[PDB]
Amino acid sequence: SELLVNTKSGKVMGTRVPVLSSHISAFLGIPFAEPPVGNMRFRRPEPKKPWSGVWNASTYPNNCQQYVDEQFPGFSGSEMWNPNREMSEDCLYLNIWVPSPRPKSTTVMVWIYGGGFYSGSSTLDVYNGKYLAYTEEVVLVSLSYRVGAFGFLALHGSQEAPGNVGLLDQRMALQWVHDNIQFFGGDPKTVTIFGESAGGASVGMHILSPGSRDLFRRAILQSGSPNCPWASVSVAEGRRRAVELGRNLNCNLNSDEELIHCLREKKPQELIDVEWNVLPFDSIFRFSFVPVIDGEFFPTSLESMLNSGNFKKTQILLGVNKDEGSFFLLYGAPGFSKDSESKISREDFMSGVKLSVPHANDLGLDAVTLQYTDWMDDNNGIKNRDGLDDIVGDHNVICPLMHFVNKYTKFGNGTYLYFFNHRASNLVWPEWMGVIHGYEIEFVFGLPLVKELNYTAEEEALSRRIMHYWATFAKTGNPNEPHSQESKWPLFTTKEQKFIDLNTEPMKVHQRLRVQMCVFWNQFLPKLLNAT
Amino acid sequence: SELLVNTKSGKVMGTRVPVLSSHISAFLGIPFAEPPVGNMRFRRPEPKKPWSGVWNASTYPNNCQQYVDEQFPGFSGSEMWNPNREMSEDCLYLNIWVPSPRPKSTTVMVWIYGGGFYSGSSTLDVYNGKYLAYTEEVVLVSLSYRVGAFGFLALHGSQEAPGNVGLLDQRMALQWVHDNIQFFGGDPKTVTIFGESAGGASVGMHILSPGSRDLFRRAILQSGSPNCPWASVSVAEGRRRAVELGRNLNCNLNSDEELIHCLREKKPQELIDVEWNVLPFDSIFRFSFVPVIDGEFFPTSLESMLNSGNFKKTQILLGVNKDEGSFFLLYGAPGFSKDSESKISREDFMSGVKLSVPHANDLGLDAVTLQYTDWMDDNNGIKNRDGLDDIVGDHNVICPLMHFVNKYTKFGNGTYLYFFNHRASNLVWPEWMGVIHGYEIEFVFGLPLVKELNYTAEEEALSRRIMHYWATFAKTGNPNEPHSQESKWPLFTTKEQKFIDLNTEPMKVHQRLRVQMCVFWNQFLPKLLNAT
Numbered sequence A, B: 001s002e003l004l005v006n007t008k009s010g011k012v013m014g015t016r017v018p019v020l021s022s023h024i025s026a027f028l029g030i031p032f033a034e035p036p037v038g039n040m041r042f043r044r045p046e047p048k049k050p051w052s053g054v055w056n057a058s059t060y061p062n063n064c065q066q067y068v069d070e071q072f073p074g075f076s077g078s079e080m081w082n083p084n085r086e087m088s089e090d091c092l093y094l095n096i097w098v099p100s101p102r103p104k105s106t107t108v109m110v111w112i113y114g115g116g117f118y119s120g121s122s123t124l125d126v127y128n129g130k131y132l133a134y135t136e137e138v139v140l141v142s143l144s145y146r147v148g149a150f151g152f153l154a155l156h157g158s159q160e161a162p163g164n165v166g167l168l169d170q171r172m173a174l175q176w177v178h179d180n181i182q183f184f185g186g187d188p189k190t191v192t193i194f195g196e197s198a199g200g201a202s203v204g205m206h207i208l209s210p211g212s213r214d215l216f217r218r219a220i221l222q223s224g225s226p227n228c229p230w231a232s233v234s235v236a237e238g239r240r241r242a243v244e245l246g247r248n249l250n251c252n253l254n255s256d257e258e259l260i261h262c263l264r265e266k267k268p269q270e271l272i273d274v275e276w277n278v279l280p281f282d283s284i285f286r287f288s289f290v291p292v293i294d295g296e297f298f299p300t301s302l303e304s305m306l307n308s309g310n311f312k313k314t315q316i317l318l319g320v321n322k323d324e325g326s327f328f329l330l331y332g333a334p335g336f337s338k339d340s341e342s343k344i345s346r347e348d349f350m351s352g353v354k355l356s357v358p359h360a361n362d363l364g365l366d367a368v369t370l371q372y373t374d375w376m377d378d379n380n381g382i383k384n385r386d387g388l389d390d391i392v393g394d395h396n397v398i399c400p401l402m403h404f405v406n407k408y409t410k411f412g413n414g415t416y417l418y419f420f421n422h423r424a425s426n427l428v429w430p431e432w433m434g435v436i437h438g439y440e441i442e443f444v445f446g447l448p449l450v451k452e453l454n455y456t457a458e459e460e461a462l463s464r465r466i467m468h469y470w471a472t473f474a475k476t477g478n479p480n481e482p483h484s485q486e487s488k489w490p491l492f493t494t495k496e497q498k499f500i501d502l503n504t505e506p507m508k509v510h511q512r513l514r515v516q517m518c519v520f521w522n523q524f525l526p527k528l529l530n531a532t
């Protein structure tokens, strides 16, 4: 049967799902690890013991335990990102969409969800792999991984809570795809990993980690890169936050053993209730438990790895959105509101700068403020709002990504860079937020092909274009069809630094994406902070 | 007789000079001090002993001893600024142009020449007062003062070489005008002092100095202000340079008495031969012997005087030119040449930055470089050339002046601000130098009214406009004619910060002159340097 697949771990039974007036096979909730529950909380994942019988893979699995966004109850803009399945520590599963009839050996794409390493679900409507698998005839995988303290609590030196175990969750799913996707018609030698935000940083982290490089062919990173200021902490900061967490829960803090045992006795929501209290600064775009620079998953610092070429050399496709910052200002900066234009007073602007660069001294705040203030019109509330927007996105997403892309292209085998700046016509968020963090995903997964979702015909064309860029890149290492008459997406090179816009207008090619601000964020400001 | 005038110091006999197919009276080379020669070198000026008989005031006096520009022999662009009279330490004289017939009690304007406190002459063709005196019916005075070491060698604590004596030369000329201009038909209660560059800084310094405030009514500063980074040094730096000077001349350095006596034995050219060797940095737009913050002429620091309102409160007219920096880059920065377009390589740009901010550390140089580099086009040699031009003018002229004008307007009684950006049609300097430091003077003194000098009719109109703005301001404290139908020059206020362009086009009003760069030069960079 087409819905029955024999794997090295056992048989699985999928389900036939409709898609665009056709059908494909879906294998939902396949386990790839032992449930990381009980005494295994905070530990590295173990591989799933093979099973007898037929595993029912007809339904979506549980989502991992996470903080849940209640800032706008009933509002689809925020709740479409919340878990849409019961939460459970028993959450290490993956999902596969397979073209029908079953392919023999086809291109594989593995989706890694974002969410600041504190949240995320493989089961969201916007991650439904059936449109991409059907349209582009790829085998689409989405994995899952522990977030929050459950995935990233780091007590370096301990083997019970070493840190990075959510990254190892991802790697074990990658190992499982490598070992088993051939049975689903996937080609294990042509696996592209792709992800957005924390998932894009994750993709970059598997590019860097020697233990991960061999498990995939090429990589796509959307609005995230491994060197992002929020994506990792040192071993000392990870230890400090773990101890502060136990301090929030009245834990014996005498030893790692005491602390871990206390934290393992707590119910999941107890950890989530206090998770945000361990941040060291009054900040935005900073998350409590994230990957740790441990000398094991990451052999040395990220910057020295990037400088020495210590990373997998292959092709990469990556990009950013126009207004990456607006989401985080909405949720955490004074003066921003969902239902107003959020014109920003000068006081509020200064408050925003401080939340945005929480590690900066007062001279650093001044440097940032000078760089982003039109002093001919300092009380322009729209310029203050857009200026804060740019600060948050430049510092947290665009300029770290530009630093990564420039270090990587020196040693890599091909780079394609995009600037996604289409505001969707059916967007439920306010105008001022612009082209929001995460809102290219629905185009990458082909949601505008579904008529009931109220996109324009031009947006369907843009989605089909992006889906084909991405799958063609996954298949060949080049998003362009050979001998095609459509406009070509030029390679990004050290010399020319070309990129394209992604929108409903005819493709335009630019160079040196936001280079003025990224020189400030990547060269000048770190020098200023290190000297003062 | 109209050419004979009885003053408190004695009688003087002027000469009738032609001007624009008419005639006026000129009284040239009137002494206002004792010759500061011999044992008086470096000392405060003494007042001139009154004389018997009639002083022959028919000819221009000697110019003070100064370094002479030989960088372009025979080239009128540079030599029109050189002394055009024999040099002598016997040089403390002033010149008066008087309308004919002699007025009874008219507006007086006193010109103070520029030249970095190391050079300058009252006798230059471009300072000929006859056009302004004739056209606007003012009594035009030009004074002189010691420059170089002769005017500004500073051994604080010594009464033989206290410093600032060139400023006291200026003040004694002002005292003489106050005491005697009534006899020439001048009104001593309506004296405007005006000057360019070091002379504009000089004007600002008499505004600040309590010993000078009472000797004039109002003030005009052109491309110079008292707080300029080159216009003054501390008492310790003045002492260091004085000692280094004696070290260059094999002087006994055991005591101030030893040092001063040695320096007084030297011929003037011996001092001039080594004057440039005492600068502490590899710099441009820095001069060896300048005013010193002595606690006497200047009671406290300039910044605290400006903050507390400790200065004469009156009306001021001031402005800058578009390309103040190009002169100094031509003479001292690598890659700039009189006869090429001076397109500037990146290496040369970096060299220029270091010469321009010689007191900056490497982080400060980076801040400057970032502020003035278009990183989308970093190898644009024209952008590097114009960028260096702007750095030099912003840092040395425009932004210090903007700092002065903003501090002053808080306490003053009326400010008028101009941006002079007309390139003269007969300019002999290359195109790349633009609207050069000092090249508004010829318009202020009415040279375009002389047909043989090859200006356009529009330039004659601009000169007449500027002459009338200036004389009307000198007469009333407002450059605008009351109940006039011509376009009005708005007051500069703390709130609106309006200024005008001065060129051959219809007047345009702008606000916040070069405010973006001046926030960098006046707020951020000093903070950066003081913290690092």
Ligand SMILES: O/N=C/c1nc(CCCCCN2CCOCC2)ccc1O
Binding pocket: A114, A115, A116, A197, A198, A276, A285, A327, A328, A331, A437, A438
């Ligand atoms: O990948 N997306 C993650 C993402 N994260 C945010 C930050 C929301 C964090 C809210 C934290 N608060 C802190 C105080 O306690 C309650 C929760 C905002 C937009 C985003 O897209």
Ligand SMILES: O/N=C/c1nc(CCCCCN2CCOCC2)ccc1O
Binding pocket: B114, B115, B116, B197, B198, B276, B285, B327, B328, B331, B437, B438
């Ligand atoms: O007020 N004008 C003064 C002014 N000053 C300069 C600087 C020229 C200084 C040349 C100094 N050098 C230094 C080395 O020895 C020879 C002389 C350039 C343009 C100007 O307008």
Ligand SMILES: *[C@@H]1O[C@H](CO)[C@@H](O)[C@H](O)[C@H]1NC(C)=O
Binding pocket: A056, A058, A059
């Ligand atoms: C698999 O699970 C679904 C939902 O729980 C159920 O409808 C279906 O019959 C199951 N298939 C089996 C048990 O073979």
Ligand SMILES: *[C@@H]1O[C@H](CO)[C@@H](O)[C@H](O)[C@H]1NC(C)=O
Binding pocket: A412, A413, A414, A415
């Ligand atoms: C990738 O590597 C191959 C050799 O393995 C080389 O021929 C090709 O030019 C490389 N492409 C890029 C874009 O570096």
Ligand SMILES: *[C@@H]1O[C@H](CO)[C@@H](O)[C@H](O)[C@H]1NC(C)=O
Binding pocket: B056, B058, B059
């Ligand atoms: C004044 O000096 C000039 C030039 O030296 C001379 O021509 C003139 O006759 C003199 N007048 C006198 C001495 O009365």
Ligand SMILES: *[C@@H]1O[C@H](CO)[C@@H](O)[C@H](O)[C@H]1NC(C)=O
Binding pocket: B412, B413, B414, B415
């Ligand atoms: C100048 O001072 C007078 C009072 O002496 C005042 O009435 C006038 O408004 C002032 N002008 C300005 C521009 O401050």
